Write a structure and sequence with these properties.
part of a larger assembly; 2 chains; A: 75 residues; mainly alpha; two-stranded antiparallel sheet; 4 helices; 57% helix; B: 153 residues; two-stranded antiparallel ribbon; 6 helices; 2 strands; 4% strand; hydrolase; 26S protease complex; motor protein
Chain lengths: 75, 153
């Protein structure tokens, strides 16, 4: 859980993060597990340089129509 | 209102041709100035009943049917901002007048308020009228803009 939370945090903050620093950032022990975990999260491993990359209502129409309805229903 | 002359000497019988076998004729009331020229003295009045037809009343409605290509037509988007700014300034002035109205109303007796706002702008109905008019215009503008932005594309 700690590792996946840290992965979620790192997916948005760092850009072009070297894998050597990732190995210690994610609290891992050996590089192979770091690469496997990165592949699980679908991060590219180009030259060990991970590049993360990566309903309510209709606007205008619904609001304006509802304002009109509220104005004219009570009249 | 149609008319038809009285007979002649039926006034000797005083029975001008009128048999009130129905209330449908007595409901109408003779006019005041018409009696001055003489209504029941020379020409008994008649009733008037415009009879329509479904075809005619259906389609005389067309006098108040706008052109189809005018609903989605937004007007120039500079007047719709000058009008808003002018309405807001008028609202500010009318609100100030409303404040002074409320201040002055504290020491007035009803026999004046019944006739106070006869000759001067009542700064309340102006506020309500401006609010309603600008809100209606604004809602129509918003709906037209959004509808065309979505459907036209």
């Amino acid at each position: 859980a700690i590792r996946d939370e840290i992965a979620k945090n790192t997916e948005l903050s760092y850009d072009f993060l070297p894998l050597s620093n990732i190995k210690a950032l994610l609290f891992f022990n050996n590089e192979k597990e770091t690469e496997k975990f990165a592949l699980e999260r679908n991060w590219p491993i180009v030259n060990s340089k991970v590049y993360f990359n990566n309903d309510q209502k209709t606007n205008i129409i619904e609001k304006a129509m509802d304002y009109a309805i509220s104005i004219e229903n009570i009249v | 209102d149609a008319f038809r002359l009285i007979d002649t000497g039926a006034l000797i019988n005083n029975l001008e041709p009128r048999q009130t076998t129905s209330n449908t004729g007595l409901l109408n009331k003779a006019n005041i100035q018409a009696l001055i020229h003489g209504l029941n003295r020379h020409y008994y009045s008649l009733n008037i009943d415009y009879h329509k037809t479904a075809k005619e009343t259906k389609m005389l409605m067309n006098l108040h049917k706008e052109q189809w290509q005018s609903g989605l037509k937004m007007y120039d988007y500079e007047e719709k901002e000058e009008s808003n700014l002018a309405a807001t300034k008028s609202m500010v002035k009318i609100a100030e007048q409303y404040s002074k109205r409320i201040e002055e109303e504290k020491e007035l007796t009803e026999e004046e308020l019944k006739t106070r706002y006869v000759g001067r702008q009542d700064p309340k109905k102006h506020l309500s009228e401006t609010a309603d008019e600008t809100l209606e215009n604004n809602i129509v503008s918003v709906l037209t803009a959004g509808v065309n932005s979505v459907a036209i594309k």
